[PDB]
Symmetry: none
């Protein structure tokens, strides 16, 4: 018998921001030090990793809004 | 029997920002040091890694908004 | 039996920004040092890696907005 | 009447050391940071001072012995 | 009346050391940072000073012994 | 009346060291940074000063012994 598929998603959505004078941002870290000894690492399927890191972040978005979507349909 | 596939996704969406005078940003890091000794690393499928980092980030987007989507249809 | 596919996607979507006087950005790192000793690395499918990094980033986009989309149809 | 001075000090003293294999010394400080705002300092006679300091010292003398002597004679 | 002065100090003293294999010394500092704003400093007689310092010292003398002597005669 | 001065000091003293295999010294700093804003400094008699320093020192003498002496006669 016949198969029919009608894939017609519609997306009218909006992600939006208003900000004023975004500014006067100072990031001044005092150095640091790291040592790593590493042996025999196996990373095998969608692993996210960090080892030894001494990281400094100043993240200041005027908006920074996130919309994350999955629409999964499976047939068998 | 017959197979018919219609594929007509319609995307009218928007990602948008207004910002004022974005500025006066200072990033002045104080050096630092790293040593890494590394052996026998096996990374095998969509791995994300860092070893021994000393990373400084200043990130100041006027918007920085994100829309991330998966629409998935699987048939068998 | 017949196979028919009608692939007619539509995209009228938009990514947009307005910013004022984008400026007065100072980035001045104080050097630093790295050493890496590395042996026997196997990276085998879409691996993202770094070893030893001492990285300084100053990212200040007037917008920095992102729209990321996948629209997947699989048939078998 | 006559004045006579006979300045004849004698110094046979000794300051001495024996040491073995002086070594295997590691000094690896993790950076740091300092800020000082300073105004109107008057230092007027044999002042010893420090302000804001973040100092690291590894002092490992094989001997490190001290002899300090004053011999003052005053006549009026 | 007569003045007579006989200045005949005698110095047979010794400062001395023996050391073995002086070595295997590592000094590896992780950067750092300093800022100083300074105004109107008056330093007027044998002042010893420091402002803002981030100093690292590794001092490993095979001897490092000190003899400090003052022999003062004052007549009036 | 007569003035007589007999200045005949004697110095047979010694400063001495013996050392083995002096070596294997590593000095490797990780950068760093300094800023100094400075106004109106008056330093007027045998002043020792430093402002803003980020100093790294590795001092490894086979001896490093010191003999410091003052032998003062004052007459009035």
């Amino acid at each position: 018998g016949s198969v029919q598929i009608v894939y017609k998603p519609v997306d009218l959505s909006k992600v939006t921001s208003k900000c004023g004078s975004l500014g006067n941002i100072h990031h001044k870290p005092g150095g640091g030090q790291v040592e790593v000894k590493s042996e025999k690492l196996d990373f095998k399927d969608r692993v996210q990793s960090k080892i030894g890191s001494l990281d400094n972040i100043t993240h200041v978005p005027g908006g920074g809004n996130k919309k994350i979507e999955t629409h999964k349909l499976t047939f068998r």
